[PDB]
Enzyme design. Sequence first.
Site, PDB file in Angstrom:
ATOM      1  N   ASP A 125      -3.598   5.414   1.190  1.00  0.00           N
ATOM      2  CA  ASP A 125      -4.141   6.103   2.341  1.00  0.00           C
ATOM      3  C   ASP A 125      -3.757   7.563   2.229  1.00  0.00           C
ATOM      4  O   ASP A 125      -2.593   7.873   1.993  1.00  0.00           O
ATOM      5  CB  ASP A 125      -3.556   5.544   3.634  1.00  0.00           C
ATOM      6  CG  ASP A 125      -4.031   4.142   3.946  1.00  0.00           C
ATOM      7  OD1 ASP A 125      -5.108   3.749   3.441  1.00  0.00           O
ATOM      8  OD2 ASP A 125      -3.341   3.423   4.705  1.00  0.00           O
ATOM      9  N   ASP A 149       1.132   5.366   1.420  1.00  0.00           N
ATOM     10  CA  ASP A 149       0.609   6.330   2.381  1.00  0.00           C
ATOM     11  C   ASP A 149       1.107   7.734   2.116  1.00  0.00           C
ATOM     12  O   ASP A 149       2.297   7.929   1.916  1.00  0.00           O
ATOM     13  CB  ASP A 149       1.024   5.898   3.798  1.00  0.00           C
ATOM     14  CG  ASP A 149       0.718   4.449   4.041  1.00  0.00           C
ATOM     15  OD1 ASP A 149      -0.470   4.108   3.901  1.00  0.00           O
ATOM     16  OD2 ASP A 149       1.649   3.656   4.280  1.00  0.00           O
ATOM     17  N   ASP A 186       0.845  -1.165   0.000  1.00  0.00           N
ATOM     18  CA  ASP A 186       0.000   0.000   0.000  1.00  0.00           C
ATOM     19  C   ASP A 186       0.898   1.237   0.000  1.00  0.00           C
ATOM     20  O   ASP A 186       2.080   1.145   0.321  1.00  0.00           O
ATOM     21  CB  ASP A 186      -0.870   0.009   1.268  1.00  0.00           C
ATOM     22  CG  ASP A 186      -0.015   0.059   2.537  1.00  0.00           C
ATOM     23  OD1 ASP A 186       0.539  -1.010   2.948  1.00  0.00           O
ATOM     24  OD2 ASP A 186       0.140   1.157   3.070  1.00  0.00           O
TER      25      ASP A 186
HETATM   26 MN   LIG Z   1      -1.587   2.370   4.248  1.00  0.00          MN
HETATM   27 MN   LIG Z   2       1.623   1.557   4.509  1.00  0.00          MN
END
Ligand SMILES: [Mn+2]
Ligand SMILES: [Mn+2]
Length: 326
Positions: A250, A195, A193
Amino acid sequence: MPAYACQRPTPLTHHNTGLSEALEILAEAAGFEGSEGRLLTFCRAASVLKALPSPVTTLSQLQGLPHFGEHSSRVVQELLEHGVCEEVERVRRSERYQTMKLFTQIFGVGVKTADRWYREGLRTLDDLREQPQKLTQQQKAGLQHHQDLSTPVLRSDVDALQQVVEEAVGQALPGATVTLTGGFRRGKLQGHDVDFLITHPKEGQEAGLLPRVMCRLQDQGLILYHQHFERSFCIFRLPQPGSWKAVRVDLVVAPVSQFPFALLGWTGSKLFQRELRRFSRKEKGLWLNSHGLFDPEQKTFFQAASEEDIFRHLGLEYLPPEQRNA
DNA sequence: CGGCATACG
DNA sequence: CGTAG
DNA sequence: GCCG
Ligand SMILES: [Mn+2]
Ligand SMILES: [Mn+2]
Ligand code: NA
Ligand code: NA
């Protein structure tokens, strides 16, 4: 060796990878059975090994190390003697571990949901797809995109994503900045992922920013899933050769007054932040989160201008992000 | 023994 | 309940 | 599961 992970540099790569991994399997399994205390100890013991300057070759080298008692020491002993720890292998093999791992890896599914599904006799992703009326919208998204979300995100992907986020952020609020955080800021070359932390140099200008960013990303056709206010857990559409892939992103907004705390928290690691907050409260009597650092005697917040400030106010030697891989 | 980090969506 | 680090 |  100090007792808290925030008191010692922990590099991304180290000299006890096999040992730390085995302990992390036991940590994960403890989490699957709701034993947060045991998870914490196995995680801490693993992290201690990551912080050592060379390989553990003999059992005696564990003497005096924090978080190594009878159980963690036996695990290492068996690994040093036989190259394998029977308890660890039994967990790896187990239907319970394998299924809980599979289910908890789905975006929208936590330990409690995974456990209930396990008890209902469900075992595979297709078992969940066969009964889709039970799933939340978030779990539906997590399941639809599960394959792409299992594929590692590369640094080239991150640079691509940062450019698109910056464009949307620049229209939402000129002067706003986008900072890469999470594992990539700690020096990881891959991740699962991405961020980002967004702020603006004029305190208060960031108010209401995230909805504006999200709507612009939406209008660009980039948002495969979003919840909609300061944290957005999205699935982005990322360009690939002749196609694209789904990527977890995110997006977090903080006022500039809080930015150093938000940066610290969002840079991690998870264990580092838990240990830092534990240290703050128990050793220094100060309450730390990703918004600030509170003295509950004076009833005052510490104004920080940098991560360096925060480490200083806690009486800790500064650790750059690449040494926070606890 | 009690404690184990502390938030937001 | 989920999410985050 | 370990620490203080
Ligand atoms: Mn994340
Ligand atoms: Mn992360
Ligand atoms: Na999950
Ligand atoms: Na806030």
